[PDB]
Amino acid sequence: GSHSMRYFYTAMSRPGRGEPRFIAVGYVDDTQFVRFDSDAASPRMAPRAPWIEQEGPEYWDGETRNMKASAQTYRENLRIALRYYNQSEAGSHIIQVMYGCDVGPDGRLLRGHNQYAYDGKDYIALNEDLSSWTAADTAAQITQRKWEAARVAEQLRAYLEGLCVEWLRRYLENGKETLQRADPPKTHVTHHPISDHEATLRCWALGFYPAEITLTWQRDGEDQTQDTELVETRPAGDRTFQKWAAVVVPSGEEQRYTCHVQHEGLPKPLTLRWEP
């Protein structure tokens, strides 16, 4: 299917408690493969998936150098943001960065991404053209002007269309046993009376990869979106994900309800009911 690579940076100031912490993580699809943490005893880019371990010392040294340089850059950007927002040096603030590429089954670029946030709010983003910017406020417009003058978008475009896609293709081949394997959900429906009048039907999906899934309840063939409780998809810790969806139903009406499951690992969507 289609695939993505993403890097995520978080830079967090902590006045009075040293310099800002910088943490970076890299993902292919829903699989983390690298991390860097400036608070580690010996900071380095480190492997977090088996298929990246085969990269040689030049790779790891280059990634570590880049993360250390990025940490220094984002410590400076935290100071700059204080100025742009007229903020005191006493508070703690956070910059977040995301970037990466999406490719189709043919490995061709579908689109690239690069977005920035300050204190959890959009700051600036590279547009889909990989050539212009959208700034969220008058502070980010200062950054935009600086980045237009320095033709920063051209450097992002060159990475996103070049090295980003080329490395993603390499990782997908080296990790094909896992990155190119979808694990379908294991599904079942549970029933719990709430009172003499009503019961909960809960439709479960366990053990699936990747995380994207759709679980829906229908009553008499009509989706019950407003009456369904849907938990956030959650990691099991073994690469796979879990999710459930529940509805409260009148006792004796249970067979009017069907749970529908869509997942990339299923050749056809599943329909399930409570089996008493």
């Binding site: 890097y7 970076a24 890299g26 880019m45 790779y59 280059g62 990634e63 880049n66 993360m67 340089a69 990025s70 850059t73 400076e76 950007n77 700059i80 943001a81 742009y84 970037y99 950054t143 600086k146 980045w147 320095a150 920063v152 450097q155 992002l156 990475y159 090295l163 980003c164 490395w167």
Partner: peptide, 10 residues
Amino acid sequence: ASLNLPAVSW
């Protein structure tokens, strides 16, 4: 591999 973007500040 990560993006190398030298000498770019906010």
